[PDB]
Amino acid sequence: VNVPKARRTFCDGKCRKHTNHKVTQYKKGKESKFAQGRRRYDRKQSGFGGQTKPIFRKKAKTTKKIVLRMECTECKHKKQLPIKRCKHFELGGQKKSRGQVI
Amino acid sequence: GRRIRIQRKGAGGIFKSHNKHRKGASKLRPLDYAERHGYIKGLVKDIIHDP
Amino acid sequence: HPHGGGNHQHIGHPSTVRRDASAGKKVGLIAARRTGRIRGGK
Amino acid sequence: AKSKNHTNHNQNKKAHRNGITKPKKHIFLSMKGVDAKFIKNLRFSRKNNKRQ
RNA sequence: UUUUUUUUUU
RNA sequence: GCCUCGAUAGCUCAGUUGGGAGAGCGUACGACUGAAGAUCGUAAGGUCACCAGUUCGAUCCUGGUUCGGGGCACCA
RNA sequence: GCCUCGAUAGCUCAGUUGGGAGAGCGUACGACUGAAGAUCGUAAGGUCACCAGUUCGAUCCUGGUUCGGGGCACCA
RNA sequence: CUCCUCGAAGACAGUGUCAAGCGGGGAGUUUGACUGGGGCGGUACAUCUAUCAAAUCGUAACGUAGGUGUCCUAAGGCGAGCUCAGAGAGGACGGAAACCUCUCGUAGAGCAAAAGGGCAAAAGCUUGCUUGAUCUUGACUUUCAGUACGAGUACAGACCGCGAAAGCGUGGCCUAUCGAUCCUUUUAAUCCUGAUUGUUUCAGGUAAGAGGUGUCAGAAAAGUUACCACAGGGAUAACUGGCUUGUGGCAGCCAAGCGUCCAUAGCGACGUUGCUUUUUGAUCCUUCGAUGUCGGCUCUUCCUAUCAUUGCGAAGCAGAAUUCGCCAAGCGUUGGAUUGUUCACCCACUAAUAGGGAACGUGAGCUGGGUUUAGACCGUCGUGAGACAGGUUAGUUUUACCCUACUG
RNA sequence: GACAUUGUGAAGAGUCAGACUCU
RNA sequence: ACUGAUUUCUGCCCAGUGCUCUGAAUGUUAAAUCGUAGUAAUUCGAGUAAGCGCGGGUAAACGGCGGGAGUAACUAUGACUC
RNA sequence: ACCAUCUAGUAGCUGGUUCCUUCCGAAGUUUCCCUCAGGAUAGCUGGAUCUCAGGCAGUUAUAUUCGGUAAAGCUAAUGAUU
RNA sequence: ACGUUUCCGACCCGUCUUGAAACACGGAUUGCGGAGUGCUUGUCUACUGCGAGUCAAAGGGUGUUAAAACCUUGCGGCGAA
Numbered sequence A: 001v002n003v004p005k006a007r008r009t010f011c012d013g014k015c016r017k018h019t020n021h022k023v024t025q026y027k028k029g030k031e032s033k034f035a036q037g038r039r040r041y042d043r044k045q046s047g048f049g050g051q052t053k054p055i056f057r058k059k060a061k062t063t064k065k066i067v068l069r070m071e072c073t074e075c076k077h078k079k080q081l082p083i084k085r086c087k088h089f090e091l092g093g094q095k096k097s098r099g100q101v102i
Numbered sequence B: 001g002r003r004i005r006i007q008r009k010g011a012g013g014i015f016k017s018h019n020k021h022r023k024g025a026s027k028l029r030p031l032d033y034a035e036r037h038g039y040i041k042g043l044v045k046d047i048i049h050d051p
Numbered sequence C: 001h002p003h004g005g006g007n008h009q010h011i012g013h014p015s016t017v018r019r020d021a022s023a024g025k026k027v028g029l030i031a032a033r034r035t036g037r038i039r040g041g042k
Numbered sequence D: 001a002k003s004k005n006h007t008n009h010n011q012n013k014k015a016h017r018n019g020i021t022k023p024k025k026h027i028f029l030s031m032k033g034v035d036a037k038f039i040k041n042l043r044f045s046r047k048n049n050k051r052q
Numbered sequence E: 001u002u003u004u005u006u007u008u009u010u
Numbered sequence F, G: 001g002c003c004u005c006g007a008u009a010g011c012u013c014a015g016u017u018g019g020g021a022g023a024g025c026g027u028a029c030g031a032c033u034g035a036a037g038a039u040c041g042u043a044a045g046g047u048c049a050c051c052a053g054u055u056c057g058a059u060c061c062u063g064g065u066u067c068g069g070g071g072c073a074c075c076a
Numbered sequence H: 001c002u003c004c005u006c007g008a009a010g011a012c013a014g015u016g017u018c019a020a021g022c023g024g025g026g027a028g029u030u031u032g033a034c035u036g037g038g039g040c041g042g043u044a045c046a047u048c049u050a051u052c053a054a055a056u057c058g059u060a061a062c063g064u065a066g067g068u069g070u071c072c073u074a075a076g077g078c079g080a081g082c083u084c085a086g087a088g089a090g091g092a093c094g095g096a097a098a099c100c101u102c103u104c105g106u107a108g109a110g111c112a113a114a115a116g117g118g119c120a121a122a123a124g125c126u127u128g129c130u131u132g133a134u135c136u137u138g139a140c141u142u143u144c145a146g147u148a149c150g151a152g153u154a155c156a157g158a159c160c161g162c163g164a165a166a167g168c169g170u171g172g173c174c175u176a177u178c179g180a181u182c183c184u185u186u187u188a189a190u191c192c193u194g195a196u197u198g199u200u201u202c203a204g205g206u207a208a209g210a211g212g213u214g215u216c217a218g219a220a221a222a223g224u225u226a227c228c229a230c231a232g233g234g235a236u237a238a239c240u241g242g243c244u245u246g247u248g249g250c251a252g253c254c255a256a257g258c259g260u261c262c263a264u265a266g267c268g269a270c271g272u273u274g275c276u277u278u279u280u281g282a283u284c285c286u287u288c289g290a291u292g293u294c295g296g297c298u299c300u301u302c303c304u305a306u307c308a309u310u311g312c313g314a315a316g317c318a319g320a321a322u323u324c325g326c327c328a329a330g331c332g333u334u335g336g337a338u339u340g341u342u343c344a345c346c347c348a349c350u351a352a353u354a355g356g357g358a359a360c361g362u363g364a365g366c367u368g369g370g371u372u373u374a375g376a377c378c379g380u381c382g383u384g385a386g387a388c389a390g391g392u393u394a395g396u397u398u399u400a401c402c403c404u405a406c407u408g
Numbered sequence I: 001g002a003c004a005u006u007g008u009g010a011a012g013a014g015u016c017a018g019a020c021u022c023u
Numbered sequence J: 001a002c003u004g005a006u007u008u009c010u011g012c013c014c015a016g017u018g019c020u021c022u023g024a025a026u027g028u029u030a031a032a033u034c035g036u037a038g039u040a041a042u043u044c045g046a047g048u049a050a051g052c053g054c055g056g057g058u059a060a061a062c063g064g065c066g067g068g069a070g071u072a073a074c075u076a077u078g079a080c081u082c
Numbered sequence K: 001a002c003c004a005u006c007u008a009g010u011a012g013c014u015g016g017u018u019c020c021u022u023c024c025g026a027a028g029u030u031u032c033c034c035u036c037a038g039g040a041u042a043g044c045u046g047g048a049u050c051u052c053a054g055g056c057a058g059u060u061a062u063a064u065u066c067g068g069u070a071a072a073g074c075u076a077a078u079g080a081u082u
Numbered sequence L: 001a002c003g004u005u006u007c008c009g010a011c012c013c014g015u016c017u018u019g020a021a022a023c024a025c026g027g028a029u030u031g032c033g034g035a036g037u038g039c040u041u042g043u044c045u046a047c048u049g050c051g052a053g054u055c056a057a058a059g060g061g062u063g064u065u066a067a068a069a070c071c072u073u074g075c076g077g078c079g080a081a
């Protein structure tokens, strides 16, 4: 899958019109240790009793829905669009050619 | 499982020493003035079998 | 016993056990640096 | 002990026991699911017709 | 450094 | 007994829609040598186990007879 | 019966996504040697097991077929 | 004389707390489902196409042939132009096949992929420009409980793309290509809250996505038990019985051939019609608050598909002998070696050494050799506990005095 | 392994600006 | 712990799993400690022991200990070769 | 091991579940579930009744449509095939 | 009418089950005992009182046929957004 690095698309921000967006790939942030879930989980785990929450062990997916973060070049408003599952992804790769020798 | 014979030996029951007829402990004399600054003479009264 | 059982009389696991093994497990050749007949001087 | 055993044996009899109920007659009166622009114009038309 | 063999009788 | 497999020159093995029976060893002769052995060339080795059938045509395909070889064959 | 694995010169074995078919021995030629063997210099060699398909092109990728090999085949 | 009892070690060891490593020595728990018993095998578990399917829709099996977890900045959108597979006839090197030209060419091509539909100034090929694969809410279809996800349909509002325009466009020509709660994370507002007043961090919220549950409406999960246990099950296997008869056994029909000649004395191929339940299978109807599960011994009776004997007919019947067939179960159908053996094989006699049934007759009749618990050995397998229609050895055989039957 | 129990002296090295750190 | 009188012997394998032996080993490592930023919670970085990983030993430790072709003057077999 | 208690432990499984008449009267099917001897869900069923006093029907007629099964065809496409 | 005798009919009940007289299980006989309850919380239905209200709690006051009955609520529950 090849996706260009620039896209003219609708902007939900102040623009409310079609504008240019710089496209990048979204990446999950670092998990904080002061999130309520982490605090609760740490307190629950501390002490005697062993593991207190399930541990997932049956992964079956081999891909992920790639999320494109597109930032408007006029207000810096950022959109997130998921695309379909793909094994290989590249941003702004070389475009396909037609009628060329191999 | 159950405790193994090795483990059962520490309680010191049927595994205690059979010492009814022992003739005593083998020990030199306590260190004292005679042995530290000279010598003391003793007479071998007996040679015996210690079970 | 750790060696007991089986349809054949066999240990089933290496008989050399580490020094810090638990009380009910420390049987056999404890902390053995080597095994087998001594060929030479030791 | 196989236990899938699908069948449609006694189902028409059950369906017909209390009759097959046909749809009501007012179902064609509702203006639900009709074009929004048409509905808007209908509201405007109805809001203005002088009664007398 | 390497260096094996040579049918039978005459 | 049943599932089968195979039977080709004195011996051992190839071969085919089915349209020729080949190879080796062995045998006879010739070349070679003082003479042999070995080596070469030729001549050679067959009812294609037997019978019946199907085919325009069967060593091969179908059935049967003989010979053998490999496997299968209560029970709780 | 089920589950896999493999099939490549005369023999034993590699090989690539798919664009090369290799290695050793064997075979053939020349040389060294009185001659053979070792040695030196060369050459030719495979059913990529058989088919169908996939894409530009398949020994390779997919499916089926033939042969071989391995493992399971347990209660009562 | 000296307030060190005499030595050794000495602020290390030891002890207290926390941290990390090891830790079946020990604890707790788990060790999917479907399934012509279970296990092994497979996935028919979420899922699409053609068929089954009996002309609306719908319709099952571990029914049949296949497919799915992807791929694509174009293989999405749109405008324009063109026509494909193939055939025929021509053209230096050029050949069956390179490239050029003309005729014919209903799609016999192509359209990412399975199958089926669909498509010709296009949905295919070439090419220009593009990002409608964007933002927002409702309605509806499909599955359906008329729940949810997924997928899709027709609009409405916005901003856009292509086109001269009408128009078309919310991803792929259509039918599969996928995911709840909790938690984490990101994007959004010049947003709300932190309740003693405020500011800034920090944390928590409202809305939309992603991180994944393939057992796909979504637990966190390895074995063994022959030392075994409990609640049940004839919903479910192992022995008898029942249906079936593939397999086993037995008997016919036609005659191509064999039989020196001669199809039918005796046989009878290629084909084909049956019968039996003494084989083994298939099934799962009865029995799991139990029908004692092999064989032998003993003892009755029964059937013949007749080995012998009685009476006969036919021969490739000149007779010991032998073969075929008919009426015929009255009466016989043995002694032994090996094996638990049924079978098998051999020795010997014999008129003959026929085949079978009766809950594979017969264990409150025996025996207990085998199978079939617990002990033990070997081989293979397993890390191990342990497994093995593989071999081996030892292993409790209970009760009738009742009714009937039978004997007196 | 860290901290406490844990005190009294020397030598070296390193930090600082008489203290600290180690050995 | 295994083996199991006497006699005679006890072959090859340290790759796997164990056990064990050294450690210079910044390869990987917790708490504590130290440094940077911040007004603080806190953030970032450095250290960071044993273990593990690397190296050596050990089978009278657990255990394990192969295939296919050709070949001798009748055949057969194959000492021999690949 | 035995004794008492937690303890009337839990059981989707087995057994039982006690008067008479009258009226109505089933289901073994759909979807989801570590679901398949069980549940929830819809269906089938009973009871209470309430609002009314012509629009309905497991039946026909008229009109109009849908379908690709039986038959038919292969001297019509595809695939066999003398 | 639980006597006898005739003619016709007549398999043993309960249960699980597609299917029981079953070669399926429980049942030798008789007496007595023996199993859908209590409470909390919901919801619907029926009846009663009052009705934008209704019920009032703990408590207090009184009551000697005094655990009753009778009286008593700026405030509380539910309802009225």
Ligand SMILES: C[C@@H]1C[C@@H]([C@H](O)CC2CC(=O)NC(=O)C2)C(=O)[C@@H](C)C1
Binding pocket: A053, A054, A056, H181, H182, H183, H211, H212
């Ligand atoms: C989104 C997916 C799931 C999620 C999480 O494990 C799921 C939860 C579900 C729940 O309700 N309780 C739990 O204890 C686990 C998670 O962190 C990852 C595995 C990814």
